[PDB]
């Protein structure tokens, strides 16, 4: 397989990925980065949606 | 002439008093029971899979220290004295442990009761790991979480504590004589008064304290020796005492045989 084919297969399985701990941590980190970008831009509307999404994804055990 | 008196008796400990024996004889008996009574212990570990958080040699060392039943180990042979190819049923005992955690949550403990005897000498009571009761779980060996498995095959061989301390049948042998210090074998350090700065021995009531007007007796020798033998469970206390006596007799008989053969 080539690099592009491997990345396409990985993206396809990520679309198929219901949940995976490493991927959930990475998504939560990316959401936190997006949240700090929205906070630093004084966007009071986007940050509420990101907080709600983080609350839905979070609350681990 | 030698006399034995037993104070307390149990499966794993006996407290006795030896009288009319030399100090050297009692000390040699203590040393023999500590270092020269043969037992059975795991010596070779074949690891087929180990995905735990513990290193392989860590688990092997822990396995070596597990006490096994060694009642009939006198009928077994030493591995280097056995003419067999590899290991046979007359010089080794084979045990097998297979552990795994099922489920995606929680932790599983691996105990010494999970060791299963697969082969060994026919009709000899050797090989099984020691257990205090029927419901006792034994010694904690490892801990496993999900998708972690341990699968090993151990070989138990006969040996003595001179080669490695895992073969020692005893843990600690208390040993004591002359609680009132009539022989003056020790000189007591003190600040004000030696009598009231030193605790009394636990056998101080077994001997008459010296009279205030008595003078030092230079003809006396140590005569009564108090000793407690504690075992790890691999052997009973009386078995350890008898086999220590037998081992000392065998060593002396070997010396005598070498002397007579020297001619």
């Amino acid at each position: 397989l080539s690099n592009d084919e491997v990345n396409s297969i990985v993206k396809m399985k990520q679309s198929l990925s219901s949940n995976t701990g490493f991927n959930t941590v990475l998504k939560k980190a990316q959401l936190q980065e997006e949240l700090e970008e929205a906070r630093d831009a004084h966007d009071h509307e986007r940050v509420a949606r990101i907080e709600a999404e983080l609350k839905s994804i979070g609350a681990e055990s | 002439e030698p006399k034995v008196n037993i104070i307390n008796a149990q499966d794993d400990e006996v407290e006795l008093m030896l009288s009319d024996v030399n100090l050297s004889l009692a000390n040699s008996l203590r040393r023999t029971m500590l270092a020269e009574v043969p037992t059975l212990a795991i010596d070779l570990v074949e690891i087929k899979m180990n995905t735990s958080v513990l290193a392989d040699e860590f688990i092997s060392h822990r396995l070596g220290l597990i006490p096994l039943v060694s009642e009939d180990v006198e009928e077994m042979k030493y591995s280097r004295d056995c003419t067999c190819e590899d290991y046979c049923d007359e010089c080794s005992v084979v045990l097998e442990l297979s552990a795994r955690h099922e489920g995606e949550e929680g932790t599983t403990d691996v105990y010494s009761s999970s060791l299963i005897k697969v082969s060994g000498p026919g009709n000899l009571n050797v090989g099984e790991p020691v257990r205090r009761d029927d419901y006792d779980q034994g010694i904690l060996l490892c801990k496993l979480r999900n998708h972690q498995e341990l699968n090993i095959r151990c070989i138990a061989k006969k040996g003595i504590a001179k080669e490695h301390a895992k073969w020692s049948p005893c843990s600690a042998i208390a040993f004591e004589y002359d609680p009132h210090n009539k022989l003056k074998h020790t000189d007591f350090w003190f600040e004000v008064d030696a009598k009231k700065e030193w605790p009394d021995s636990k056998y101080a009531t077994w001997e008459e304290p010296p009279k205030p007007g008595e003078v030092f007796d230079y003809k006396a020798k140590p005569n009564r020796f108090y000793m407690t033998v504690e075992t790890t469970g691999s052997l009973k206390a009386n078995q350890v005492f008898s086999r220590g006596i037998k081992t000392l007799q065998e060593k002396l008989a070997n010396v005598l045989f070498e002397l007579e053969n020297s001619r």
Binding site: N7, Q14 | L44
Partner: protein, 45 residues
């Protein structure tokens, strides 16, 4: 011919000395070799 294991999702696969060093399913860039098949023995001391 040689087995590997992913550093993230612990998935097993094989490589033929021509594929990129990557996990098949999650695309991690870190993989580990599998344990050998030779006999392993210790002296329990």
């Amino acid at each position: 011919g040689v087995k590997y294991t992913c550093g993230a999702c612990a998935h097993n696969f094989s490589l033929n000395k021509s594929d990129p060093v990557r996990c098949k399913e999650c695309g991690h860039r870190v993989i580990y070799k599998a344990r050998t098949k030779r006999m392993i023995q210790f002296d329990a001391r």
